[PDB]
Design a protein around this ligand. Structure first.
Ligand SMILES: Nc1nccc(-c2ccccc2)n1
Ligand SMILES: Nc1nccc(-c2ccccc2)n1
Length: 158
């Protein structure tokens, strides 16, 4: 049948030449895991403006520009609505990261990416982001730990 309907999300990775900024989610879905900054796109809001807003809300940072790097669709067994996640990166940040209600930030050196405490899917697509390759992916999860199916492809244009 038809693909499930999806909710539009953004995900932002602050990626500098030697380090990446990650936030530990403090509560709720995905609590305890390190990852990028993001959330739901709002009505009338462009995707990139939503990405800027979520980054500012969750880390306090503003950015000059955001670069589109990928798109990932997430499906969770038992929930028919998908997450349609537009992934961005930036390397020019203004301000300092601050702990928010949602996220506790730390910088990680790029030879210390904490995959064991990140979402399982990050092990597959984060290496492509680091190579400056654009990608489309899909991950079907049972709960928060188990991947039942995934697809991933490098693309020329996100
Ligand atoms: N790495 C990962 N894995 C599963 C889900 C997500 C997600 C990110 C931003 C917003 C909503 C979901 N991210
Ligand atoms: N807590 C939870 N569990 C499973 C799925 C979801 C979901 C959230 C937003 C959009 C699509 C799915 N949320």
């Amino acid at each position: 049948g038809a693909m499930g309907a999806s909710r539009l999300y953004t995900l932002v990775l602050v990626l500098q030449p030697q380090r990446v900024l990650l936030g530990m989610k403090k509560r709720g879905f995905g609590a305890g895991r390190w990852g990028g900054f993001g959330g739901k796109v709002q009505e009338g809001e462009t995707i990139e403006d939503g990405a800027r807003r979520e980054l500012q809300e969750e880390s306090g940072l503003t950015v000059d520009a955001l670069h589109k790097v990928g798109q990932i669709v997430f499906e969770f067994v038992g929930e028919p609505e998908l997450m349609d996640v537009h992934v961005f990166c930036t390397d020019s940040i203004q301000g300092t990261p601050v702990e928010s209600d949602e996220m506790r930030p730390c910088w990680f050196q790029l030879d210390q990416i904490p995959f064991k405490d990140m979402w399982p899917d990050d092990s597959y697509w984060f290496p492509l982001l680091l190579q400056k390759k654009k990608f489309h992916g899909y991950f079907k999860f049972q709960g928060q730990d188990t991947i039942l199916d995934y697809t991933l492809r490098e693309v020329d244009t996100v």
